[PDB]
């Protein structure tokens, strides 16, 4: 489905000190009648001389993928994409978490299987467990493991933070938690990573604070309500 | 009628045990062998399971278990049974074979492993 | 049995045939019977440029495979061979595997992202317009019409026009009332396209623009516990969305009762918060309000956070910002009755108004927006109306032609 309203724009790091025009010497000569398949977002490198100019496919029509036919009417549309696009270098995958091959296996069996294979659990008839509580020495890779197992699975993610909720004034935490849970449930399947849960639900003896008690009670009441079985 | 609930009756307010307020106190203790057997029979009614299941042995081996822990044990047994079949099921294919989906059954060995874990 | 690939503008397909012994006619018949492509559209070729044509005649021009008589064996077709099929229209080739969109990795939401994305409600403290100055003559005329001709029983409304200063202060110059039907708790404005264009032309000639909208609350509405009703808030938000000015002012005319029992008419000018305009432009508000709906709280299609309280229904006072009211005597008077009212403006009323202000200069006689609009009903909106409005604004000597035409039309020819 050769594209019509395609968009092809270059990258900043390769257009610095560029030799000049790219439409008639870098884009058209090597991509007119070339019939090269193109996918939106691909960083492809082309040469119209000694300088190699990377290009990012901003937009295509059809949006997903197409082929660069002479029907493609776009030129070098001015704007060079900055390196900031690679600053969010696809966050974290799986190869970026290493050294633990059993804890990650348990987390996968508890998370990726219920959210991608309810048929097995329905056939056996078991109720899969929801709550998971990572712990370990500080700075050992807990948040990283959670991000790796929640970004690779492609499910809706929701990263609540301990101090972030605690920093807000009294009367807002009780609303923020409920709004967070009600938003997460609405987008099944959903993962709610509550980092530093020890800050918002400490040991009751060690606090003796009214607002702490109230927020703990709100968290408990909300948590007991996750029995909707809506993949949260 | 008012029905309280607690864990240690000593920790409650001592003024709530006076005549007329809370005058009946009942102790829901840890079940014995027959209790554990009945709890397991209640919980494993819906699960598929092979005829080899020896619930009496599981009841006798479990000591100090309560109802919640026995529910967790049954769930662990089912998860172990799924995990042992995982070596042939491919996660990239959401089209799990229907005969495969109906060829999975929990046995006594999975229960023993879950009890060990 | 032979497998032949079929390339088209939509992509690639494959067909299984008996063999190369058949001709192009049999291949076309098989394509019609398998891919459901009609015979009159199918065009076969071996060149890759066949799909680059844009006309069935151009497709048939490639006669290397267009002719159905030619045997397929003579073309040396084999297993996995390449053929090009062109047909009218664009189709979706089946068998497409799912493809994820670009950049859809790491959908990490947050509490702050929830706060920003989810619509909330708060009462803005300081508005963009620090103070709005109302013309004394226009305010007096509007108050007189509301209190006497309506007795605060029928709702009346009008757009406010004036100039906007650098600091945001607005000097109200006149009020335009479009054709409308008023009742106890609603006011439907049957706005006229030509009349609105004439008003805009007058404002352009008068060097001003729309700055807000005014309406009055009946006696029952004043006694109710709100500053504005849901319908009034919705109408004001809709007009603000239509407007492009950040200094929009919603003015309320209310018959307040003092502690001594006297009835005093007050103009309360408030600027709607930009939260309300954001709500309206995102289609959150429900333009359908039932009689059973409470006018105290606004209607929204989706739940929002009203400050600290999470309620879909939102009190109207959360949308208004108190703006100081000022009075000034601008270059425009409003002694002439406002158009589209119960007392319809006619030529006799025009003559009476001219006779009343006979001692005033001719430029001062026509220094009334309603009179200018009534003239505009018989003048060119593109040229004559802006020129007359500019002459009124600059207080320049009126051209003899305009004065003669006005006098002739005001004296029954
Ligand atoms: N097992 C691991 N594999 C790979 N990188 C790791 C691992 N553990 C820690 N890191 C690296 O540690 C750095 C930061 O650690 P991080 O996992 O963010 O701390 P944390 O343990 O989540 N902190 P806290 O939530 O305060 O206990 C990152 O750059 C990770 O790449
Ligand atoms: Mg953390």
Is B75 touching A (CB cutoff 8 A)? yes
In terms of Cα–Cα distance, which of C346, C393, C341, C395 is closest to C371?
C346
CA distance A33 to chain B (A): 37
What whole-number distance in Å separates Cα of residue C160 and Cα of residue C251? 9
Q: Do A159 and C112 touch (CB under 8 A)?
A: no
A156 to chain C, minimum CA–CA distance in Å?
A: 7
Helix intervals (H) in C130-249? 136-144, 193-205, 219-223, 230-242
Q: Is C226 left (phi over 0), alpha (psi -120 to 50) or beta?
A: beta
Pocket lining: A49 vs ligand 1, CB cutoff 6 Å:
no
Output DSSP code: residue C317.
G
Contact yes or no for A90 and C310 at CB 8 A: no
Q: Do residues C203 and C162 make contact, with C-beta atoms less than 8 angstroms apart?
A: no
What interhelical angle do C384-394 and C193-205 show, nearest 10? 40
Give the residue from B79, B86, B90, B100 with the most A CB atoms within 10 Å of its CB, the best one to mutate. B79
Give alpha helix (H) positions in C187-307: 193-205, 219-223, 230-242, 274-281
Kindly calculate the radius of gyration of chain B based on its CA atoms and give it in whole angstroms. Answer: 21
For residue C15, what are the CA distances in angstroms to C32, C77, C82, C88, C344? 11, 13, 11, 19, 78
Between the alpha carbon of residue C406 and those of residues C69, C191, C333, C359, C401, the distances in Å are: 85, 26, 18, 17, 9
- What spacing in Å lies between the alpha carbon of C76 and ligand 1's midpoint? 63
Asked whether C273 and C236 are in contact (CB, 8 A), the reply is no
3-state secondary structure chain B: CCCCCCCCHHHCCHHHHCCCCCCCCCCCCCCCHHHHHHHHHHHCCCCCECCCCCHHHHHHHCCCCCHHHHHHHHHHHHHHHHHHHCCCCCCCCCCCCHHHHCCCCECHHHHHHHHHC
**In chain C, what residues touch A144 (CB-CB under 8 Å)?**
none
How far is CA C222 from each of CA A120, C217, C229, C233, rounded to the nearest angstrom? 64, 6, 10, 15
If you write DSSP's letter for every residue of A31-68 in order, what string do you get? HSS---EEETT-EEEEESSSSEEEEEEEE-SSSSEEE-
CB C367 within 8 A of CB C336: no
Are chains A and C in touch, 3+ Cβ pairs below 8 Å?
yes
Contacts of residue C256, defined as CB under 8 A and 6 or more positions apart, other chains included, come to C222, C263, C264, C265, C266
Environment class of residue C323 by beta-carbon count within 10 Å: exposed (0-12), middle (13-18) or buried (19+)? buried
Residue C98 contacts A where some CB pair is shorter than 8 Å: no
Q: Which chains touch A (3 or more CB pairs under 8 A)?
A: B, C
Contacts within 8 Å (CB) and 24+ apart, B53-61: B53/B106, B53/B107, B53/B108, B53/B111, B54/B108, B54/B111, B57/B108, B58/B111, B58/B112, B58/B115, B59/B33, B59/B34, B60/B33, B61/B115
- C106 interfacial to chain A (CB closer than 8 Å): yes
Q: Closest by alpha carbon to A44, among B13, C375, A52?
A: A52
Whether C286 and C301 have beta carbons less than 8 Å apart is answered as yes
Residue C13, by phi and psi: left (phi above 0), alpha (psi -120 to 50) or beta?
A: beta
Residue with tokens 């301990």: A162
Q: What is the H or E stretch that residue C120 is in?
A: strand C120-121
For residue C217, the tally of other CB atoms under 10 A from its CB is 23
In angstroms, the Cα distances linking A218 to A126, A173, A175 are 29, 9, 9
The sign of the CA dihedral B95, B96, B99, B101 is negative
Tell which of A106, A123, A129, A204 to mutate to test the B interface (max B CBs under 10 Å): A123
d(Cα C256, Cα C250) in Å, to the nearest integer?
A: 18
- A214, two tokens: 């109230």
Report residue C146: phi and psi, to 5°.
Answer: -65, -45
Rounded-to-integer distance, Cα C106 and Cα A96, Å = 14
According to DSSP, residue C98 is labeled P
By C-alpha distance, which of C105, B90, B87 is closest to A153? C105
Q: What are the backbone angles phi and psi of residue C17, rounded to the nearest 5°?
A: -120, 170
Q: Where are the alpha helices (DSSP H) in chain A?
A: 12-15, 28-31, 84-87, 103-111, 118-124, 142-151, 162-167, 173-185, 197-200, 210-224
Hey, what are A226's tokens? 């996750």
Q: Using alpha carbons, list the distances in angstroms from residue A8 to A55, A56, A74, A76, C374.
A: 7, 6, 7, 6, 57
- H or E, element range at C30: helix C24-35
Q: Residues C270, C130: contact at Cβ < 8 Å? A: no
Distance CA(C159)–CA(C370), nearest Å, equals 13
Give the Cβ contact number of residue C283 at 10 Å: 11
Neighbours of C322 (CB within 10 A): 15
What DSSP state is assigned to residue C94? Answer: S
A17 lines ligand 1 (CB under 6 A): no
Distance from the alpha carbon of residue C115 to the mean position of ligand 1, in angstroms: 28
CB contact under 8 A, B47 and A117: no
Phi, psi (rounded to 5 degrees) for B106 = -80, 140
- How far is the centre of ligand 2, averaged over its atoms, from the C-alpha of C103 (Å)? 25
CA-based R_g, chain C, Å = 35
The partner residues of C163 in beta bridges, in order of sequence, read C171
Chain-centroid distance of CA A214 in Å reads 33
How distant, in Å, are the alpha carbons of A36, A53, C205 from that of A69? 8, 20, 53
Q: Is the CB of A68 under 6 A from ligand 1?
A: no
What are the backbone angles phi and psi of residue A177, rounded to the nearest 5°?
Answer: -65, -45
d(CA C179, CA C198): 14
Residues in a beta bridge with C212: C160, C249
User: Between chains, do A164 and C112 touch, taking CB under 8 Å as contact?
Assistant: yes
Handedness of CA C154, C159, C162, C166 (dihedral sign): positive
Give Cβ neighbours of residue A99 (< 8 Å, ≥ 6 apart): A141
| B115 contact partners, CB below 8 Å, separation of at least 6 | B58, B61, B62, B73
DSSP label of A169: P
Dig out the tokens for A24 from the structure.
Answer: 């008639």
Q: At a CB cut-off of 8 Å and minimum separation 6, what does A2 contact?
A: A66, A67, A69, A71, A72, C9, C51
Q: Which residue of A has its CA nearest to B46?
A: A125
Query: For residues C143 and C190, is the Cβ–Cβ distance under 8 A?
Result: no
Experiment used for this model = cryo-EM
8 A C-beta contact, residue A114 and residue A128? yes
Mutate to test the pocket of ligand 1, among A99, A140, A145 (most ligand atoms within 8 A of CB): A140
Residue of A nearest to C53 (CA): A71
Which residues from A are below 8 Å from B45, CB to CB? Answer: none
Contact of C355 with C377, CB cutoff 8 Å: no
Determine the distance from the C-alpha atom of residue A73 to the mean position of all C-alpha atoms in its chain, rounded to a whole number: 33
B78 close to A (CB below 8 A): yes
- Closest of C278, C273, C234, C228 to residue C251, by C-alpha: C228
List, in sequence order, every residue forming a beta bridge with C209; answer none if it has no partner: C162
End-to-end CA distance of chain A: 39
Quickly list H helices, C62-104.
Answer: 63-66
Q: How far apart are CA C142 and CA C84, in angstroms?
A: 77
Would you call A83 helix, strand, or coil by DSSP? Answer: coil
Q: Which candidate from B75, B91, B102 shows the least CB-CB separation from A126?
A: B75
Cα(first)–Cα(last) distance of chain C, in Å? 96
Q: What is the distance between the alpha carbons of residues C14 and C161, in angstroms, rounded to a whole number? A: 69
Dist. CA A59–CA A64, nearest whole Å: 9
Contact A125 B102 (CB under 8 A): no
Check pocket membership of A171 for ligand 1, CB cut-off 6 A: no
């Amino acid at each position: 489905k050769y594209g019509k309203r395609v968009h092809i724009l270059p990258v900043d790091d390769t257009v610095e000190g560029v030799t000049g025009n790219l439409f008639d010497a870098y884009l058209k000569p090597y991509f007119l009648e070339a019939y090269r398949p193109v996918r939106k977002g691909d960083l492809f490198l082309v040469r119209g001389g000694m300088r190699s100019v990377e290009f990012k496919v901003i937009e295509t029509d059809p949006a997903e993928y197409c082929v660069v036919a002479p029907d493609t009417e776009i030129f070098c549309e001015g704007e060079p994409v900055k390196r900031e696009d690679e600053e969010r270098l696809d966050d974290v995958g799986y190869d970026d978490v290493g050294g633990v091959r059993k804890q990650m296996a348990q987390i996968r069996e508890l998370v990726e299987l219920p959210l991608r294979h309810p048929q097995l659990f329905k056939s056996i008839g078991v109720k899969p467990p929801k709550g998971i509580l990572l712990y370990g020495p500080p700075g050992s890779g807990k948040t990283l493991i959670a991000r790796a197992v929640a970004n690779e699975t492609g499910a809706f993610f929701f990263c609540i933070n301990g101090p972030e909720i605690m920093s807000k004034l009294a009367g807002e935490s009780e609303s923020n938690l409920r709004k967070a849970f009600e938003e997460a449930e609405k987008n099944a399947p959903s993962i709610i990573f509550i980092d530093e849960i020890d800050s918002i639900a400490p040991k009751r003896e060690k606090t003796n604070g009214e607002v702490e008690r109230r927020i703990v009670s709100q968290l408990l009441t909300l948590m007991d309500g996750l029995k909707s079985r809506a993949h949260v | 009628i008012v029905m309280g609930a607690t864990n240690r009756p000593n920790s409650i307010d001592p003024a709530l045990r006076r005549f007329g307020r809370f005058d009946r106190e009942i102790d829901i203790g840890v079940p014995d062998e027959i209790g554990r057997l009945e709890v397991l029979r209640i919980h494993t009614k819906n699960m598929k399971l092979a005829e080899d299941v020896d619930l009496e042995r599981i009841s006798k081996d479990t000591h100090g278990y309560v109802g919640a822990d026995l529910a967790a044990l049954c769930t662990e047994a089912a998860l172990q049974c799924i995990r042992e079949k995982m070596d042939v099921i491919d996660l990239e294919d959401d089209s799990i074979d229907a005969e495969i989906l109906n060829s999975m059954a929990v046995t006594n060995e999975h229960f023993h492993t879950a009890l060990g874990n | 049995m032979m497998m032949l690939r079929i390339r088209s503008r939509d992509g690639l397909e494959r067909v299984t045939a008996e063999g190369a012994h058949i001709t192009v006619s049999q291949l076309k018949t098989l394509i019609a019977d398998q891919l459901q492509i009609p015979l009159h559209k199918q065009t076969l070729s071996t060149n890759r440029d066949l799909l680059l044509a844009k006309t069935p005649a151009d497709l048939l021009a490639f006669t290397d495979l267009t002719d159905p008589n030619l045997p397929l064996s003579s073309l040396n077709l084999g297993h996995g061979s390449m053929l090009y099929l062109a047909y009218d229209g664009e189709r979706s080739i089946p068998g497409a595997p799912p493809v994820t969109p670009a950049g859809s990795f790491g959908r990490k939401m947050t509490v702050d992202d929830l706060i920003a994305r989810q619509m909330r409600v708060t009462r803005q403290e300081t508005s963009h317009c620090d103070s709005v100055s109302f013309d004394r003559d226009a305010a007096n005329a509007f108050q007189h019409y509301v209190n006497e001709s309506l007795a605060f029983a029928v709702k009346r409304g009008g757009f406010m026009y004036g100039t906007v200063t650098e600091e945001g202060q607005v000097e109200v110059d006149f009020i335009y009332e479009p054709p409308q039907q008023g009742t106890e708790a609603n006011l439907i404005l049957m706005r006229d396209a030509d009349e609105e264009k004439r008003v805009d032309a007058i404002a352009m000639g008068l060097g001003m623009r729309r700055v807000g909208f005014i309406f009055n609350q009946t006696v029952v509405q004043d006694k109710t516990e709100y500053t504005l009703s849901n319908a009034e808030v919705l109408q004001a938000a809709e007009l603000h969305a239509e407007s492009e000015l950040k200094e929009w002012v919603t003015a309320v005319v209310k018959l307040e009762v003092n502690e001594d029992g006297g009835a005093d008419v007050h103009f309360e000018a408030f600027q709607m918060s930009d939260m309300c305009i954001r709500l309206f432009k995102e289609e959150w508000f429900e333009t359908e309000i039932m009689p059973d709906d409470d006018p105290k709280l606004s209607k929204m299609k989706k739940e929002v956070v009203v400050g600290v309280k999470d309620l879909k229904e939102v009190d109207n006072d959360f949308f208004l910002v108190l703006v100081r009211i000022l009075d000034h005597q601008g270059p425009l008077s409003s002694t002439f009755p406002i158009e589209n009212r119960s007392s319809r403006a006619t030529m006799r009323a025009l003559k009476t108004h001219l006779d009343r202000a006979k001692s005033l200069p001719l430029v001062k006689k026509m220094s009334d927006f309603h009179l200018l609009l009534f003239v505009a009903q018989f003048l060119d909106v593109s040229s004559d109306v802006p020129a007359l409005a500019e002459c009124v604004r600059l207080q320049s000597p009126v051209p003899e032609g305009y004065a003669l035409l006005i006098e002739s039309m005001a004296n029954t020819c």
